Write a protein that binds this ligand. Structure first.
Ligand code: FOT
Ligand code: FOT
Ligand code: ZN
Ligand code: ZN
Ligand code: ZN
Ligand code: ZN
Lengths: 362, 362
């Protein structure tokens, strides 16, 4: 007996096109999404070139429309030069992403004053998300309060971060957050198996106590999102390993395992992979779209999942219970038992749908 | 310039059919809903006969399918006899409603033990909502904790209730709540104008300090819902006035006025009349459905709104800014500038749609 779920949404993926297509492209990354039960993705802007101006967004839109197999929205990225310049295209993006810790030169912000300028100029009704680790969470929250608006914190990893967000929510502040599966199912204890290259990720893996704190504070977590960050094994094991893990194909199986163990309920999962993503990012429903899962089948994660070009996974060897059997996307069978059946280009930009525009006052 | 909103959802209406059709019926109450920008309603079970067993639910389903002009789900009601008997029909209902304070004999629960029995027997994945005033909020929260599940508190009216819910959410407890417009826009100060009959409602109107506390604690309010409770003027002004106000036609205009004054944002409103209702009650999207509003037009609420058979309103004389201009429901024009254009029977039971069933483990 299969369980029918709505179309799940991952608000944090890196699809690497343009400019890093040996790591992933729209076609391979959205195949990975469908195989993971994900029918809509929001793609980060740290591509090459990065999505920091209107021409780069226009190129990325066409590449996604031609390559994506599931539906999508594309983030814009904040830079040291573009505050006050994005107003005409802002509403066509998923939101604005701020890289407040480590990043590439083009996305680096030199001052908290530059963060303020973005919060002041980006349209007030549109989403802002931040990569913000440890005390940076408190700092960006202060900027949000000074500018009287909301913020969403990406990939929360540590006890100190989730407790700070919990304290802010207790004071009624408009902050939401997401947690990635590696910060719920891996810890420092796994670094000896993974090694120092494969284990590189930002935010870094937490301690066992960090992991325990995220589970204890599930009520504070608004979304799950993969931070799918594919790099090849050669890159992860080489002389200057880039940070990040692939995760689209493993996220739902890991979380279904936790549901079957009673660590959270099916509803808790659907709030965090469907309803809260929809409402925080103003993402539209997908007609005639659903995912059928088998909650009984036990399997062991292999050394690589079938679709991501990363061709490796940090979850190798973990035993899971739960598997995606079939995905229907807008009335067409998109995935069945390991086979993707919609071509590159089947996916659409949800911000172009009438129901996908963010409502605003005139 | 009109603003496009998604189809709004009111999770708390009394439509009086069967058995009280001089006060309202499915046809008139759903006309009132559409005129208020509401495209889906959840109807309470305290009809005559009340919806407390399978035969009564079957009758109500047919009356709604024949009379409703917008989409709907129907609540079941808890009684002193029906715990453990609703399992076959539970999933076809909006949820289970508990009347924990004043009510009719058939819906009266004699003991907190009977509340426990309902929490233990009603399927764990389906919604439970409670009419629970003052210390009853704490009492039903304790029952929810003892039985390890969630609860939703109807029409929160007082400072003491919203602060208790706030404290429970700070402890990570699974509780949500709704607030009705009369508890945001009327207070004891209005009882001299209204008089003692018209002013009768349960929960009663709060003090000015209660109203201020609800606004200050907006972050704690998950939903707005009208508690549309129509009675005729003759009944409200007679010797034994029944409690309740009509509210479908005035709820959105009142809240749009508050948006235009900066008391809450448009997003804050849409979370509370669209996204959070959807996610708490597992209500499906409505395809090709939207509401167009004019935020500039100032008008004064008259002595009765056009559609509700209540034919009176406690908001008479209030100045509002905001009006519903057009409603489209599943691809058909349903309302334009005071005219309803879909017939009785156009509305459907959303729990019969494949996407409207509540997901559960096998
Ligand atoms: O794009 C990436 O690989 C990446 N990887 C990470 O581990 N963290 C990031 O913040 C990031 F942008
Ligand atoms: O049905 C009604 O009129 C009604 N009216 C109220 O004012 N409160 C209730 O709890 C109720 F059930
Ligand atoms: Zn990041
Ligand atoms: Zn990322
Ligand atoms: Zn009530
Ligand atoms: Zn009621």
């Amino acid at each position: 007996k299969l369980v029918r779920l709505p179309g799940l949404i991952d608000v944090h993926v890196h699809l690497r096109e343009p400019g890093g297509t040996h790591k992933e492209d729209f076609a391979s990354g959205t195949a990975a999404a469908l195989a993971g039960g994900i029918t809509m993705v929001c793609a980060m802007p740290n591509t090459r070139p990065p999505i920091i101006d209107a021409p780069a967004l226009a190129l990325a839109q066409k590449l996604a429309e031609a390559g994506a197999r599931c539906d999508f929205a594309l983030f814009l990225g904040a830079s040291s030069e573009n505050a006050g310049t994005l107003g005409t295209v802002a509403g066509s993006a998923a939101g604005l992403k701020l890289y407040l810790n480590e990043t590439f030169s083009e996305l680096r912000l030199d001052s908290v004053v530059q963060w303020m300028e973005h919060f002041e100029t980006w349209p007030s009704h549109l989403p802002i998300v931040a990569h913000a680790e440890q005390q940076t969470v408190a700092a960006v929250l202060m900027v949000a309060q000074l500018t009287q608006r909301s913020v969403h914190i990406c990939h929360v990893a540590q006890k100190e971060e989730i407790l700070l967000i919990k304290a802010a929510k207790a004071r009624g502040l408009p902050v939401t957050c997401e947690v990635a599966p590696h910060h719920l199912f891996l810890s420092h204890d796994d670094l000896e198996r993974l090694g120092p290259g494969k284990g590189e990720v930002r935010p870094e893996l937490g301690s066992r106590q960090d992991v325990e704190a995220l589970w204890e504070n599930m009520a504070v977590i608004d979304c799950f999102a993969s931070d799918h960050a594919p790099h090849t094994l050669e890159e992860k094991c080489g002389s200057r390993p880039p940070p990040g893990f692939p995760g689209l194909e493993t996220m739902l199986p890991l979380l279904l395992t936790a549901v079957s163990e009673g660590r959270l309920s099916l509803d808790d999962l659907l709030q965090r992979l469907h309803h809260n993503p929809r409402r925080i990012f103003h993402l539209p429903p997908q007609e005639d779209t659903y995912v059928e899962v088998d909650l009984e089948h036990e399997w062991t994660i292999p050394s690589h999942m079938p679709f991501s070009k990363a061709h490796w996974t940090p979850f190798e060897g973990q035993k899971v219970k739960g598997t995606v059997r079939r995905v229907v996307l807008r009335g067409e069978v998109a995935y069945i038992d390991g086979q993707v059946l919609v071509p590159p280009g089947y996916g659409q930009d949800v911000r172009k749908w009438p129901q996908g525009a963010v409502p605003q006052l005139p």
